[PDB]
RNA sequence: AAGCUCGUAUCAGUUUUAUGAGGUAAAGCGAAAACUUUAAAUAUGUAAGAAGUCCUUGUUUGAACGUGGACAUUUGAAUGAAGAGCUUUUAGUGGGCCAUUUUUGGUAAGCAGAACUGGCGAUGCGGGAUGAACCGAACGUAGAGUUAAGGUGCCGGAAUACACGCUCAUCAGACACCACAAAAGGUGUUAGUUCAUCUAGACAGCCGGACGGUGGCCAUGGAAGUCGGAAUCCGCUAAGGAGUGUGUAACAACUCACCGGCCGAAUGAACUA
RNA sequence: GCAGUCAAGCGUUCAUAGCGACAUUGCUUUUUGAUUCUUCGAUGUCGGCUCUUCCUAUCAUACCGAAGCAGAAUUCGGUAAGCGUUGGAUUGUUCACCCACUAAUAGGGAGUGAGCUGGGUUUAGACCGUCGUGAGACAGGUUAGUUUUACCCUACUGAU
């Protein structure tokens, strides 16, 4: 959709000589607070043997970005269970934002690897702050001094049904 | 082969003498010289046919010890 | 074979050099009607 | 290249690559014999027949020669100024240029300066030289030495390499009975001439050893006095 | 098909005296022409066969020399 | 995987001039002139100093930059051919019946005509091509030697010299008859 | 319905609580997995007030059994609400397919027998080109608006919309479908995982080395690394097999396995989608 | 087919709980091309004229690739359905096999009772054999052993 990030903070329930439990929190990306809540209930009892019943929310917030206009390099890492045994696997995209990455990381792996939301779980959103340490050479090949390119040839677009002109893909 | 000595499923397919897979029947083992304990010599064991004749030709079965 | 081609009972003397519960194997086989 | 790509060709021979450990153990011994010895020649022997240099080697038990990678040799010597086993290797080290060659020894100077001087073996063109003669293939039978000895003790040529003279070393010949046979006047080499690579192929085919090789020197060094002397010899 | 001691039983065995009995009891068969036969007596004939040849049938070339030798 | 651009370079001798339109080549040398018409392999040629002519494509698959260094070649093969010259040298050999070649214009087209091959009536022609100088060499018994400025004519015409002489229905093991090239190499020599 | 005694705050294809039953660990932890200390359900039975509580105690004090008064409706969980029970008898019916969910048994492969729950027959309407079992859907007569399922190049009402990838098929593909040939074969293309080589210079190319005992032993007309058989060792090296192919009647000659020289930055193998 | 051996992978991780491709051995009669004088129960229908058209899984004709392919004649394959693919003898049976001509005598579908008939339809008869106490029935065998339309609408062929 157009994500957003929130930051969920859950906890067990209280209980005689168990009181103040130790106050879990994750990173979730989705559409609204309602997927998030869901998400985090779902991977707390997928880590361990905590569940919904018996647990509560603390606290759902949104997180922003710090600075939303200046580009960046992420390697996001990702797991997921499609269709046969499951494997990891790292990527490496140039954007503006966390969400935006993820957003295309997201359109990426439906495209290719048949893949749908619950099947994929993000691990890691980290932003590469050196240079040089990228990897990925389609990434790699937009960092050179002095770049410029052409736009994609043979492309126009028009509105009317009967043109008097022959139009040229100035060019 | 010297007899029939069992067929599952019927009696009376025993009698008749039919080969159906299953079966137990009695061979004539003389030309695997066996010999048992005092001295004597065996010439007819049991074996289980393993296999539908009626898809081959072949019976073929195996022996009982 | 060729790559491990790198690194790397009991018969008298006559027999060597030469070569060659009560169940039963087949219970419950499937029936067989009448027709 | 996901697809469409050479595949390569696996071959079962019993041999193995030398590895790392090769070049590790080289640069170790050179640097652990560096202070056995005191004079530490080098040496330009590019196209050396192994016989020819087990001689050279046998023709004293007593002082080590070794062979190696180029930059290997250097890392056991020391680039710049800034790192070496001993003292003013340096200015022997940037000389080395071709199959070089690293002689230790436990003599005097001057005998090794005249061993040096005084030793060279018959062998082949090895291209890009100067051709130091002039042969032309008689035009008849081409018999199996080439025509320069006396052609009625040389037996024919035998069938087997036609295509190799008729399409490599570009040679107009054809096939009459079993002997290889020639009509026209041949000329290899005219003496006093580069030899490219075709050349050569076709001089050493007939088996004429006409070449002068004698190992050469370029620089040296002493230990006892720690600077080197370069002194030239061809 | 149940469990049981019999099937693994031997059933037909036969001793010493009396396969050299029969042995030596087909040597002397006096053929009548009008006498048929009735019955048969099941006994284990591959055993009382083999009367004395003089042959030593050839032996196998093809163990020693295949053919690409 | 889509590289942003793929480039070669074309390097240019001092005696010719190449001049590049749309996607009309034309190469002008010392021996004569030759065009090219690559209207159907979507580069872009760009000049840089009347001796180096760089040649890109933007934004390109692999099927696409295969395409590339396949128009440097044939760029280069005019410009070696306006310069050098091509020579081909073929030689025709036989057993019992000798081949008898020989050049005859049949109303301005200059055919080679090949006689007696193998004993047989039919006299096969091969048609010259417009470019192409074809003579017996001397000093060599049956050997007829073809040059030219293009390569795709000395080739070619070599090819169907070569192939208007099979022997068909017969073992080519012991049938030896025929018309093979010898050599490929240049004018200049040396 | 004939009809009449009874809408009596009592009922219910429902949840909750108490408790039994599955006992599978998947809670979760042990006295040297060796539990039962104990979950969360999965549908599985029963029970949750007036025919009920207390006082007081006569018979075959605890067992049932008799007795003489106190006890009030937020009177003993939640949701919904007025259509359960006898008598008369009076009409039709009394034997069958599809699918799902459990269970048992099955062989070439199908499947067969039990049980629950929906569809059909008795039933139109919208969609799937066409359809009894597929997706939607509360059938009087009309007006207006909004939608379901399916759709929107033209047939044909509705974007030749927007954004990101993949694909070239000399019978592409657009499927009652996730079953059948179905596991592999391909120098088609794209992404990914795990191991390696590498400026003491990788991968591809050219050029040089490729040695000595030694034509190693047995074979036989001839077998010198290369028709065969048994070993497969030693020396010298940077490296060089008692030898990967071409070749000879036997040799010679070329070649790679392995080293080095020229050049200069990334390369290879296996594997999954 | 049955009983094994192997061993790349798969299987939650797993060899060894298990599966398990490709390879491989056991034998159904006799090591010297010797004649094998099996020819052993189809319970239901094949077999044959006249005439079209289609498939390719190709016999011949055209073109190619490979073989100890010297020449001649062959053998194994690729494209290809344009063209052709015969005359007779045999019912004490023809779910076949013979001998000739030929370039070759390939395999099939649509079939086919309204365009034709042979065993086989069964009947009306009769006799012989087997069975039954008998009337009768059949393990059989022999003989006898009738189906005709369009003058309607379409399709096809020609004609106004």
Redesign the pocket.
Same mark, same amino acid.
């Given at each position: 959709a157009h994500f957003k990030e929130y930051q969920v903070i859950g906890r067990r329930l209280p209980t005689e000589s168990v009181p103040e439990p130790k106050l879990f929190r994750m990173r979730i990306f989705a559409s609204n607070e309602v997927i998030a809540k869901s998400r985090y209930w779902y991977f707390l009892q997928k880590l361990?043997?905590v569940?919904k019943?018996?647990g509560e929310i603390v606290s759902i917030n949104q997180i922003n970005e710090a600075h939303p206009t200046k580009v960046k390099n992420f390697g996001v890492?990702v797991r997921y269970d !499609?269709?046969?045994?499951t494997?990891?696997?790292?990527?490496?995209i140039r954007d503006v934002s966390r969400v935006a990455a993820v957003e295309?990381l997201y359109?990426?792996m439906?495209?290719?690897?048949?893949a749908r939301f619950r099947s994929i779980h993000i691990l890691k959103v980290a932003e590469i702050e050196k240079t040089a340490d990228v990897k990925?050479?389609?990434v790699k090949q937009f960092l050179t001094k002095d770049l410029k390119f052409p736009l994609p040839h043979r492309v126009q677009? !028009?509105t009317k049904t009967f043109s008097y002109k022959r139009p040229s893909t100035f060019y | 082969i010297l007899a029939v000595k069992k067929n599952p499923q019927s009696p009376m397919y025993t009698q008749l003498g039919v080969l159906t897979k299953g079966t137990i029947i009695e061979v004539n083992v003389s030309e695997l010289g066996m010999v048992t304990a005092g001295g004597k010599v065996v010439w007819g064991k049991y074996a289980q046919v393993?296999?539908?004749?009626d898809?081959?030709?072949?019976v073929?079965?195996?022996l009982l010890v | 074979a060729h790559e491990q081609?790198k690194v790397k009972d009991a018969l008298p003397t006559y027999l060597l050099d030469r070569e060659?519960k009560f169940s039963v194997?087949?219970p419950?086989?499937?029936?067989i009607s009448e027709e | 290249?996901?697809?469409?790509?050479?595949?390569?060709?696996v071959?079962?021979?019993?041999?193995?690559?030398?590895?790392?450990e090769?070049?590790?153990?080289?640069?170790?011994?050179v640097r652990e014999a560096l202070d056995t010895y005191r004079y530490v020649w080098v040496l330009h022997?590019?196209?050396?027949?192994?016989?020819?240099?087990?001689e050279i080697?046998?023709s004293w038990?007593g002082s080590?020669?070794?062979?190696?990678?180029?930059?290997?040799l250097?890392?056991?010597l020391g680039?710049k100024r800034e790192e070496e086993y001993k003292e003013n290797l340096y200015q022997l080290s940037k000389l080395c240029?071709?199959?070089?060659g690293l002689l230790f020894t436990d003599e005097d100077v001057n005998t090794v300066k005249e061993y040096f001087k005084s030793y060279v073996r018959s062998?082949?063109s090895?291209?890009?030289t100067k051709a130091p003669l002039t042969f032309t293939i008689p035009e008849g039978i081409v018999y199996?030495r080439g025509g320069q000895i006396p052609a009625e003790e040389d037996?024919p040529m035998?069938?087997?390499?036609e295509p190799?003279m008729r399409n490599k070393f570009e040679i107009p010949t054809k096939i009459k009975a079993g002997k290889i046979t020639i009509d026209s006047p041949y000329l290899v080499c005219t003496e006093g001439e580069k030899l490219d690579?075709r050349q050569?192929?076709i001089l050493?085919?007939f088996?004429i050893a006409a070449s002068e090789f004698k190992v050469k020197v370029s620089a040296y060094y002493d230990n006892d006095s720690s600077t080197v002397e370069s002194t030239n010899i061809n | 098909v149940q469990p049981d001691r019999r099937w693994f039983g031997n059933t037909r065995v036969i001793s010493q005296d009396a396969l050299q009995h029969f042995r030596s009891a087909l040597g002397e068969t006096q053929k009548d022409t009008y006498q048929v036969l009735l019955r048969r007596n099941k006994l284990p004939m591959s055993l009382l066969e083999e009367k004395d040849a003089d042959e030593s049938?050839?032996?196998?070339?093809?163990?020693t020399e295949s053919y690409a030798? | 995987?889509?590289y942003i651009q793929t480039e070669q370079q074309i390097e240019v001798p001092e005696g010719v001039t190449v001049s590049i339109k749309s996607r009309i080549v034309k190469v002008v040398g010392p021996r004569g002139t030759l065009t090219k018409n690559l209207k159907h392999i979507d580069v872009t040629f760009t000049k840089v100093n009347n001796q180096l002519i760089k040649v890109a494509v933007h934004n390109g698959?692999?099927?696409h930059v295969?395409a590339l260094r396949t128009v440097k070649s044939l760029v280069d093969n005019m410009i070696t051919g306006v310069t050098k010259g091509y020579k081909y040298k073929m030689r025709y050999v036989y057993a019992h019946f000798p081949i008898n070649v020989n050049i005859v214009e049949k109303d301005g087209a200059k055919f080679i005509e090949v006689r007696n091959f193998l004993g047989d009536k039919k006299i096969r022609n091969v048609p010259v091509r417009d470019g192409v100088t074809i003579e017996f060499s001397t000093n060599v018994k049956d050997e007829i030697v073809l040059s030219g400025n293009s390569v795709e004519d000395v080739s070619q015409n070599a090819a169907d010299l070569q192939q208007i002489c099979?022997v068909?229905?017969?073992?080519?093991?012991?049938?030896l008859d025929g018309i093979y090239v010898s050599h490929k190499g240049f004018i200049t020599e040396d």
């Open positions: 361990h043997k569940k019943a018996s890492w !499609s269709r046969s045994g494997h990891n696997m790292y990527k490496e295309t359109q990426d439906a495209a290719r690897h048949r990925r050479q389609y677009k !028009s | 393993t296999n539908e004749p898809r081959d030709g072949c073929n079965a195996v | 081609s060659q194997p087949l419950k086989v499937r029936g | 290249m996901p697809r469409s790509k050479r595949s390569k060709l071959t079962l021979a019993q041999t193995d690559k030398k590895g790392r090769n070049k590790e153990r080289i640069f170790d011994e022997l590019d196209d050396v027949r192994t016989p020819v240099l087990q080697r046998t038990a080590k020669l070794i062979m190696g990678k180029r930059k290997v250097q890392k056991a680039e240029s071709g199959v070089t062998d082949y090895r291209p890009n199996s037996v035998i069938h087997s390499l190799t690579v050569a192929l050493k085919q088996g | 049938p050839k032996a196998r070339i093809l163990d030798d | 995987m889509k698959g692999r099927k295969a099979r068909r229905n017969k073992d080519i093991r012991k049938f």
